[PDB]
Amino acid sequence: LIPSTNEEKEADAAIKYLEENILKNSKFSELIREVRVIKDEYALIKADLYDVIGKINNKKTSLMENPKNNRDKINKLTQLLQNNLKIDSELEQLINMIDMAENEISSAAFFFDNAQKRLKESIIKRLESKNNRSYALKLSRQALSDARSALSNLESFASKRIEPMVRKEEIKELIKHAKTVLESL
Amino acid sequence: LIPSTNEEKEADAAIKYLEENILKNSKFSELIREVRVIKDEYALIKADLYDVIGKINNKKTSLMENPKNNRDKINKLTQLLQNNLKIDSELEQLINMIDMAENEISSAAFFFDNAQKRLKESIIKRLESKNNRSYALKLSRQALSDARSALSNLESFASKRIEPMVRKEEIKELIKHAKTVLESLNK
């Protein structure tokens, strides 16, 4: 199970290095909670901005059915509204930033996870080639052994048919000598 | 597909030794047939013997119910019967040598075909072990790569921590101010 090859060690070393001073200073669950707190905090800030923008617009609209008398008011309000669209715009960027961040840390846990799996899978395949190469050799030796048992069988066959091949006609005549002695008596 | 290792080579040579010197472009089946031909020849011969045993066991009981002095001309026929029964044995032996012969050539064929398959299996298995090793390397590299991806995100994440913790109070305050401006108009 231990990693052996230079590459297996090189991965193991990288994984254990994340594990034993990064993910033991600051673990994944507690990094995810970290961000989700501020993500929530920024959503309340958005909510509040949207509330005041709406109040700005609703006041401006009302004042606008009397725009001569409300010119100043309408101007402060127009300007004020335009300022908050800018605030909204910079807030969006930050909310984007915190979204990426939340993804990045969920990528990390993903990648880290997969990495551990990918190394387990590599060591297991190493052992599969080791077993396969070992079985090759043994196949090559069994093959040699079969060829020898084949040889030893072929020699046994060779020598067992000699007597029978050699005494056949000696026996054919030994019969059919004594046939003609049945003929005549 | 060609024998490379010393042990693949050594099995190659033991198979080809039989092909070249013992077998010589005459299948196992040919050797079987030749054994079968002589078992049939002996089959026939044992019939013939059995057949003229019967015929002695007549002219020894037949032509022996009118026998001009039975005791003497008995021996000659029992001598043959006995002289042609011991053979009936030597014959059974030879028939058995031929069956043992036929069984040997059966086992030869089994081991021979197995030598060939075992040898093909080993070459194939050897190549399989190297592909498995290629895949083990690819898998072990992808592990490093994944470990470095994970790093990249943890670095990237870490460099987004501070901008928002700083900027956020200032935004809270710009917001406080906006609603201050708006209340004030309403006076």
Residue numbers in the entry:
A (entry chain A): 5 to 189
B (entry chain B): 5 to 191
Quote the study on this structure.
We determined the crystal structure of a previously uncharacterized B. burgdorferi outer surface protein BBK01, known to belong to the paralogous gene family 12 (PFam12) as one of its five members. In a recent article studying the antigenicity and immunogenicity of PFam12 members, it was suggested to rename the proteins as family twelve lipoproteins (Ftl) FtlA (BBK01), FtlB (BBG01), FtlC (BBH37), and FtlD (BBJ08). It is known that PFam12 members are surface-exposed and highly immunogenic lipoproteins that are upregulated as the tick starts the blood meal.
The protein crystals of FtlA diffracted to 2.7 Å resolution, and the crystal structure was determined by a single-wavelength anomalous diffraction (SAD) technique. However, in the crystal structure of FtlA, only residues 110–297 were built in the final model, as electron density was not observed for N-terminal residues 28–109. The overall monomer structure of FtlA consists of two comparatively short α-helices, αA and αB, and a 120 residue long helix αC, which are connected by short loop regions. In the protein crystal, FtlA forms a homodimer where the αC from one of the monomers interacts with the same α-helix in the other monomer by forming an antiparallel coiled coil structure of approximately 180 Ǻ in length. As judged from the crystal structure of FtlA and taking into account the conserved residues of the PFam12 members, the potential DNA-binding site in the PFam12 proteins might be located in the middle of the dimer, along residues Arg242, Arg235, and Lys118 or the distal ends of the dimer where conserved residues Lys281 and Lys182 are located.
